[PDB]
């Protein structure tokens, strides 16, 4: 009692039910999708640009003064120099993508400005040094040494003023008053790392005093020190710490040092593939070239796993400044920050809100202020009410965070 379908039994299904419009509606839909294809290969519009110039100015350029750049001009490569020798060159040079070579200089130069760690012009066949070139100054530093005013007010990161007061004492007081250090007989600290929960004010307290420095400031991408090519990131961190120590009163901000970090004084450090090239070179140039400097460097990360005790050996890094949560008055200050710049009611109170935000960051406090506005968009409103924020705190904190089972309450009132 299962039966399967014979060939005549197939024809019962396939016939019954609109046998006038079945294929009539179907092959029209079938060949139109064929026709969607047949337009597309028929169109095939795609064309090139290839970046030419208008022929008003290049026709005389396209004369023999292209061949004068073809055959007289050359195709010389660039490299780096390890070192030199005395009274005779015997220079040691890496292509580093090809091999390392022991070469000579060509006759067109003087042996003075062929110093170590320099870009030079290298012959294709005889590999002689043709022209010494600059280290490509300066997009390797000044493109992150922006020297530009950021749009962060001092009143934006209010509520954590004592952690600011730690950082205001460490950074500002030697850079503008190294006089009471002489009047008392002390020297300033020169190492501070930042760690703690994400979205706490790390980049804010960095950028607020980067706004209040009137001076050189450098922000450093953590993945920028990670490179594709082996032996390339160390060469970069060479060029950063050299040309930042040149001018005075500058700040460098390391950020997300998880990729370049890890305890190298402790059990691990079994790495050594282009991460340690960056790492061993920076800890080389962090001390050694810094007794009694002028440029302070700050690190910041979300993971306190990657603390190096060799960094925390004094001379490199001294102080563990971490950030915390606001008690209440810090939070009520922050709610006033993220709600003064939007269409609100003049009668809401914010101390009721920070009661409902026990363990929360200003990232979450900002998220509530945006979410409460989103409830005002749901209805036709243009100003927020009290209950707009009250639904937002319920939507943010009492939904995904560490409190559930609200109806079974009945033990506490």
């Amino acid at each position: 009692p299962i039966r399967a379908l014979d060939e005549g039994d197939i024809a019962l299904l396939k016939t019954y039910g609109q046998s006038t419009y079945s294929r009539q509606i179907k092959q029209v839909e079938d060949d139109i999708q064929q026709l969607l294809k047949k337009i597309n290969e028929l169109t095939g519009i795609k064309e090139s640009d290839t970046g030419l110039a208008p022929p008003a100015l290049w026709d005389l350029a396209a004369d023999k003064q292209t061949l004068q750049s073809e055959q007289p001009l050359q195709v010389a490569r660039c490299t780096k120099i390890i070192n030199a020798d005395s009274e005779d060159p015997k220079y040691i040079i890496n292509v580093k993508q090809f091999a390392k070579f022991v070469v000579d200089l060509s006759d067109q130069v003087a042996p003075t400005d062929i110093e170590e760690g320099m870009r030079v012009g290298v012959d294709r066949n005889k590999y002689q040094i043709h022209i010494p070139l600059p280290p490509k100054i300066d997009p390797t530093v000044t493109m992150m040494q922006v020297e530009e005013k950021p749009d962060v007010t001092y009143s934006d990161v209010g509520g954590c003023k004592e952690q600011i007061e730690k950082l205001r004492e460490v950074v500002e007081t030697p850079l503008l008053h190294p006089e009471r250090f002489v009047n008392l007989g002390i020297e300033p600290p020169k190492g501070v790392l930042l760690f703690g929960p994400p979205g706490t004010g790390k980049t804010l307290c960095a950028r607020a005093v980067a706004n209040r420095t009137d001076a050189c400031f450098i922000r450093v991408i953590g993945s920028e020190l990670v490179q594709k090519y082996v032996g390339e990131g160390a060469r970069m961190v060479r060029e950063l710490f050299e040309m930042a120590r040149t001018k005075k009163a500058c700040l460098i901000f390391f950020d997300e040092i998880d990729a370049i970090g890890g305890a190298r004084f402790d059990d691990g450090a079994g790495g050594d593939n282009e991460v340690q090239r960056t790492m061993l070179e920076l800890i080389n140039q962090l001390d050694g070239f810094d007794p009694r400097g002028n440029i302070k460097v700050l690190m910041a990360t979300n993971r306190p796993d990657t603390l190096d005790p060799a960094l925390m050996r004094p001379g490199r890094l001294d102080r563990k400044i971490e950030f915390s949560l606001p008690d209440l008055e810090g939070r009520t200050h922050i709610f006033k920050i993220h709600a003064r710049s939007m269409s609100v009611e003049r009668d809401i109170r914010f101390e009721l809100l920070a009661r409902l935000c026990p363990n929360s960051t200003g990232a979450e406090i900002r998220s509530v202020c945006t979410e409460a506005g989103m409830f005002a968009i749901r209805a036709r409103r243009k100003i927020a009410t009290e209950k707009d924020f009250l639904e937002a705190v319920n939507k943010v904190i009492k939904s995904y965070a560490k409190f559930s089972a609200t109806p079974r309450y009945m033990t506490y009132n």
């Binding site: 290969e41 095939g44 795609k46 064309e47 090139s48």
Partner: protein, 50 residues
Amino acid sequence: LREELQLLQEQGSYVGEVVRAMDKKKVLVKVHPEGKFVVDVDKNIDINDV
């Protein structure tokens, strides 16, 4: 046998993959272990090779 032995004595052809490339008698080929090349066609084939 002479026709074989002469075509044997010949440096072989490369192979490069094109999913798509631009028109106007020149296409854009990355080959196997290398970069991309703007090349020219032969005249026994079309520009409709894509």
